[PDB]
Amino acid sequence: SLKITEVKAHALSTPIPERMRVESGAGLKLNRQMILVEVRTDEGVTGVGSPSGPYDLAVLKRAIEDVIGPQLIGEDPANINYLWHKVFHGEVSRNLGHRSVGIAAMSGVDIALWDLKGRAMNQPIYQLLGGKFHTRGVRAYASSIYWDLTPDQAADELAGWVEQGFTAAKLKVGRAPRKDAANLRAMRQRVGADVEILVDANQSLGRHDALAMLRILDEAGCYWFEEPLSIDDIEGHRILRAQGTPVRIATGENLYTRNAFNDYIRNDAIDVLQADASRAGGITEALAISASAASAHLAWNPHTFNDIITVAANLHLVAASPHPAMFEWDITHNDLMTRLASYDLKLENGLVQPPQGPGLGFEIDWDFVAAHAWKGEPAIGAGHGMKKEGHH
Amino acid sequence: SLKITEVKAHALSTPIPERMRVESGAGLKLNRQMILVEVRTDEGVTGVGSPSGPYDLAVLKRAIEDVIGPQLIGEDPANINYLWHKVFHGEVSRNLGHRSVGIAAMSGVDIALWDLKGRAMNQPIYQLLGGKFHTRGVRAYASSIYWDLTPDQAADELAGWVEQGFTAAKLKVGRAPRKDAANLRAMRQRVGADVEILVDANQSLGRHDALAMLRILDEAGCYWFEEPLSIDDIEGHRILRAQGTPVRIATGENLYTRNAFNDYIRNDAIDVLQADASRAGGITEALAISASAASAHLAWNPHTFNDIITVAANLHLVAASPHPAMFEWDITHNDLMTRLASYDLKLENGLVQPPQGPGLGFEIDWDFVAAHAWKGEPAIGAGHGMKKEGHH
Amino acid sequence: SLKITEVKAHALSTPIPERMRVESGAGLKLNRQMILVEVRTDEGVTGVGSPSGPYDLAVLKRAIEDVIGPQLIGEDPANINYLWHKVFHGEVSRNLGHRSVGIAAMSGVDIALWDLKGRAMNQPIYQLLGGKFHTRGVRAYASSIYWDLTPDQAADELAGWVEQGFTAAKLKVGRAPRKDAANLRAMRQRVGADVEILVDANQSLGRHDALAMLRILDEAGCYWFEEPLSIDDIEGHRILRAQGTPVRIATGENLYTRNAFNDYIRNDAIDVLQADASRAGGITEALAISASAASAHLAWNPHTFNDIITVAANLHLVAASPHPAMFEWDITHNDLMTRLASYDLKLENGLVQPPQGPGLGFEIDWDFVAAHAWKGEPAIGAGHGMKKEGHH
Amino acid sequence: SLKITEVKAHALSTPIPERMRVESGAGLKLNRQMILVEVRTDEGVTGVGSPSGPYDLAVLKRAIEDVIGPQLIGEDPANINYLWHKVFHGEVSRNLGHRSVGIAAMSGVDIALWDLKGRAMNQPIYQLLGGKFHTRGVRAYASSIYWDLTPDQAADELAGWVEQGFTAAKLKVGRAPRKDAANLRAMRQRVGADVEILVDANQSLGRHDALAMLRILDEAGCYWFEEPLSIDDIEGHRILRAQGTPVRIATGENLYTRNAFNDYIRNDAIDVLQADASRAGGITEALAISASAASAHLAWNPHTFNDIITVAANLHLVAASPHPAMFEWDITHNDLMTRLASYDLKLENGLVQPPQGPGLGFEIDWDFVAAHAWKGEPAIGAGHGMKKEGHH
């Protein structure tokens, strides 16, 4: 058996041209960043992973290398189930907080342990997980069409993504609801009924404006309403789902561990769980959340937005899971989607395929890694939520 | 008006001699640590605070100085309410996690803003909060009698705290429930019926063993059962409360913001909310939680255990609030309770009094701060939770 | 420390020209009255307050000077939290009734204690409360457009208030629902979508007519439906909220203490709590109600309508609270809004600012006080509610 | 038809010798007071009533004569149902508070209208109400055995009331629950199983101590637990009822109108409604509450404690109602029970009989009324409630 010898966290940053920066309720994007986790062993088998973002890269590096890492040195990396609980109970729940950047830090390390296990077996992760459910491929959506567009501009962007071969795309809303509505109406008129239109408010609305928005999403035939309210208001999400519309209420990028999703389920407050393998606790935890969603006759469609590793880790689980695919694919300017690894966007009839090599299924460009060390750049400007909080 | 010029986080560690290290379900105590936050202004008015612990000091320093602090520089510190929400929505919820060490970091900065405001006004914080409710004083309990004791030892430690003037004390339980029960029985036999006995399992029990323990606490007339289960299992806390015993179900040191407490209230799952002003979001947040507890006809009795600043911040609010007092006082070896500041334990008829000077009400020994810089020492050993999780 | 030496209640009345008298379901206004509470101390620091109205001025004076006052003489006014509970439990709940004009009488005295504390500290009340949340200013609405208008008249009045610089206003309804509906439709057509239109039925409707009204308010995009039903029918308010419209169900001017609002919250029966610091128990109690509203992800927007002191006391708390501002400003003929104190209406971009002096933040014109002593004038004609009760 | 010409409120006080003053959670009794209401008509037919107490006599006199009375002058007193609602909607709900000393004032005037109507018809009130249900008589209990007793004293006071002919009596509890329990145990031991023992805590306990006390009341076979908690905590009363003991949960002397009782019924929170016809709204209102209790399969057993008019008004209704009788009879020193009127205690086989003359059924000693004008004496010392609130 192997022994883990080191847990490393490489802070990386890549720039975005000013005119390509986009804004949602999460804030104005400034640089696309990540931590590349590397777990090394005594026989030279290495796994890599990512704890998503944006968080703060110094906080993630310290958590991974100095809080979680020590609990792993000397251990057999094959016992990923044991190591997840050893780290959660030993340190991270109490000492970084139970719904925290520490859970995202664990997620990066858990993805690297799964990558390491697939490489040790010479199999792609989806094969360990029981092989494909989606044998034809996984239906993707273009993420996303951002704020600051007129309705003809939002419809032209959607149409462009449809032309590139997507069959679905997502619009960010929440700052100017009359304008969001006009964007949706123009987008639906442009593409017709077979392209799916998803909407994401990044927690920017209150309950009454979310109810008014849901009526427009229902009229426009939208597939889901993501983060319509603060993730802290579970009853508001039940109220939106209780309207009985065909529009799914979706959340989960900012909820952590299966415990959060069980509280939404128990309160009849969710249709689509969006737990991200790279944020909500790892592949090990997202596996459990996907199964709990199916048990409650709901769907799991992860958030995937940060880098090609968070995309690939979720894509292995989505391909192996019995849920309808609605697979998030970042189409914004992001070198971590094109230059870190050899696995790229390739759509055929609106579907992507999981990488096919061992582990996550591709190799890292270590020369790109070495050239993009973080030097203190910010990832994202201040996020929103003060308006709906009540600040004029 | 003032302008904030700097937000500083001094990482401090103080040792614990091997024989004086106690152990609970949170793990074996190794060093008593803190961050001393210092908010400076252009006119030289400084506030100090603490984000409690144990949490990793490098993660707290980076959150405070580099994630929170940039949102404060140049702002008028007098608008604490605005700054709390600017920091929560602009950075901490999304980018450090909504129930996280980022919320503890906010709490330490929020305490420092209150301390600065009281120093600016020449008033102790409790006067700003509407003055005392507890005009005679605040009833304290000795925290705690720990694991590894025989029944006669636990009874002798209790009688010792009684002899010192305490009218209540807390026993830690959860590793060996037959021994815990024998300790309680001996303790109650020793002191009779008017001394209150609190029990705290630090999340170390499952539901069935906590149901079995609650029968013993009811027979022993215990005042509350603290952290009986994982903070993640709200329904199990409802099940214990639904037994209708006179023993209060209490939790809150590891729950964050008023949102977590509202979920417990809405599920009939809590009698005593223990949100700590230095962990759950600040004096600003704990004020809202104390009022929400009173509206639901429940009580707020905070966790206070880390240092004399986390003690004092909560004591100002406790003194001002209309709850029965059951005020946590750490009686374990802790130089952060004796040597940081000029306020100490002074028990009279079982009661303590809040500091009376401006702000938090005492000044810091900055020679003590300079002599105890953290050098990478760990605060606490690995916590427990794997046993009840299922690891034999 | 100070000692309270006297609690005085000055009964005042000011006239309204016949043609400027307006009617709502509360009755036809006849004279704008108040009690000016004055709390004096042994060192000459005085606080002033008001217990709102209309009540009966002799009942309020007797309650303040002879029921509540005796409990305060000799006490340190700094312990406002203690004094509130001393008076509630000692006398007012049992001996004036738990939801009563005695709670309003306590509120006047509690505002004066807060004014006294701000003056003693040389700070505006909002600073004690943690400073501003609304750092830009507080969005006001013009209260109100009354009964007896045709639709073109109601739209002309709204348009006039918009011209004066309000961005919102409230219409009184409930006597002739077809006419109220026509008024709303004309008002919305006149101003377009960005001005907020609020509706207040002063308890004048039953459940089925309130359901029919809510449909028209939803069509007209109204911000809230205030006192749609008797305050005694909590289930009727749940039924209106359960329709799931974007129109908030609002009540609270005639509900007392946080206990009333907890019963609405627990029954899913309210969106906007309108507890008035000068009626529902004081600044101390409205602080607790504002925080309980936020904890339940609802809003607190006080009723403020009586005099410039009830306006200012609420405005200090609104400015410091994290709720959307929708701040009631009496625009009817009322000398107690223009001549009692130096703080006046001043709108900039639809917002008001809190007074900036110590305490409530302005000085009283004691020569105006001395010239407007009550001489037995009525404040308000008989109120309504017999029609919906069933009287043809 | 008649026309009302005057509504008068005679403020009366009668002393209590120091040794005969008893104390409960409502406070230490000092003077037994009342308002004797007198409604006069143009043909000289007068009705009398009482709004119970203790409530401040100047507040009651002003409410009666100057707020309620002007709505009655010139009206036909025969339309009691119309006048009740005219007064509630026209003035008292809004302008004195919906659960208030204004509702007690209404009750005293409503009693006088019933008394006038019975005198006009030459019939006792119970005949108007459909005659007797309790054709044999009404089972009374001795109210009460108070604080400050040893167990042998409380047992001897109980056995004394038994020797006088009572088959039931009430013990006041709440200051020292170990002593209360010892008093009960001694009392039950003394009288055996057929004498009913009632317990009344006058809102002086929190939920956990009331749960502990309810176990003792169940062991002692007690008939009811009255005002176990604040009247403001409906959910705590549900919790006590949900224990499923044979001990009835009873409250109502400090709850107003049928709306308060409907909220307790709808929350499964009451077994015995104690609305007093002289406090909760009148004979008119208590008739509706008694019927609402019977529809829910619960009981109405009113509080009656203030004077022989509050006694007699409730006894007419009790005699006519199909509830088990447990009729409160004040056995404490009270000249308002012996010297106001010609009806007194006459116990036969444990039962009393309602007065048999017109109206309330007796005439007033108007020389006694003229000799006991109130001169500003207090009725009751400060009540209790600060202890359970949390003041040590």
Ligand code: NA
């Ligand atoms: Na999203």
Ligand code: NA
């Ligand atoms: Na604890």
Ligand code: NA
């Ligand atoms: Na109103």
Ligand code: NA
């Ligand atoms: Na009673």
